[PDB]
Design an enzyme around this catalytic site. Sequence first.
Site, mmCIF file in Angstrom:
data_model
loop_
_atom_site.group_PDB
_atom_site.id
_atom_site.type_symbol
_atom_site.label_atom_id
_atom_site.label_comp_id
_atom_site.label_asym_id
_atom_site.label_seq_id
_atom_site.Cartn_x
_atom_site.Cartn_y
_atom_site.Cartn_z
ATOM 1 C CB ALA A 139 55.486 75.251 67.111
ATOM 2 C CB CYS A 140 56.529 71.576 63.201
ATOM 3 S SG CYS A 140 56.341 70.496 61.780
ATOM 4 N N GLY A 141 54.254 69.229 64.518
ATOM 5 C CA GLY A 141 54.073 67.835 64.861
ATOM 6 C C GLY A 141 55.016 66.940 64.065
ATOM 7 C CG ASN A 186 58.872 74.940 64.604
ATOM 8 O OD1 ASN A 186 58.658 75.148 65.792
ATOM 9 N ND2 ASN A 186 58.327 75.638 63.616
ATOM 10 N NE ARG A 203 54.521 68.183 68.825
ATOM 11 C CZ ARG A 203 53.805 69.092 68.185
ATOM 12 N NH1 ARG A 203 54.255 70.340 68.093
ATOM 13 N NH2 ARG A 203 52.627 68.747 67.650
#
Length: 138
Positions: free
Chosen positions: A9-11, A7, A14
Amino acid sequence: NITIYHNPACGTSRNTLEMIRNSGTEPTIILYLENPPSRDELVKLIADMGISVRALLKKNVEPYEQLGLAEDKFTDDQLIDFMLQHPILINRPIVVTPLGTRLCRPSEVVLDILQDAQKGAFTKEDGEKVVDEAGKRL
Ligand SMILES: [Cs+]
Ligand SMILES: [Cs+]
Ligand SMILES: [Cs+]
């Protein structure tokens, strides 16, 4: 052969993706929110990860709240089928390598299953040092 259920959008997701890359391979990237695993694949991921079905459940997301999943009223297969029908319930990131499968929370859990060592120091996007130039875990 590396796969990450990612995802962007998920640190945590990332940081995990960049650690994989820093080990020198580009993984297959599966946007699980839009391309979730099949039931069979999901059951296998769960087994291989060695965690409980509930441990995989993402809290603080709409279906978790509105279906009442905080309550202990659900069998594992009920929970697995909720995850398939509502893929945002699958916590992230999951990474598969030849060495094994992990829910990489926190992200540096991925270091366990990457076959090749980080090629240089790694620092998370918020500045938290993970490994130094030498290769030592910090
Ligand atoms: Cs699939
Ligand atoms: Cs390792
Ligand atoms: Cs953080």
